[PDB]
Write a structure and sequence with these properties.
Oligomer: part of a larger assembly
Number of helices of chain A: 0
Strand content of chain A: 15-25%
Strand order of the largest sheet of chain A: 1-4
Radius of gyration of chain A: 16 Å
Order of helices and strands of chain A: EEEE
Protein name (chains A, B): Flagellar hook protein FlgE
Largest sheet of chain A: 2 strands, antiparallel
Family (chains A, B): Belongs to the flagella basal body rod proteins family.
Subcellular location (chains A, B): Bacterial flagellum basal body
Chain lengths: 50, 50
Amino acid sequence: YSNEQEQVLGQIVLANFANNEGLASQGDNVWAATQASGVALLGTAGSGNF
Amino acid sequence: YSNEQEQVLGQIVLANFANNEGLASQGDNVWAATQASGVALLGTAGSGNF
């Protein structure tokens, strides 16, 4: 900002699957979860597996 | 003045920053204090760090 400060406006989540190789492609450059893919398992980009 | 007298009319202040090379240039022969430069620290031209 113009008072020489900084403010967060949110952060970006990522997601990791228990298995790749099984996501269904959905037109544009996007995939969708399927059976034999795994549920979402969201997280942040700092630590963990991301 | 006309009657062989002297009169003060002001005094020029100087500024001295905690760090140079953070000052962003602003067009003319002119800088602008911002983050990674510091607060102004006004002073006089007599002595001190000036």
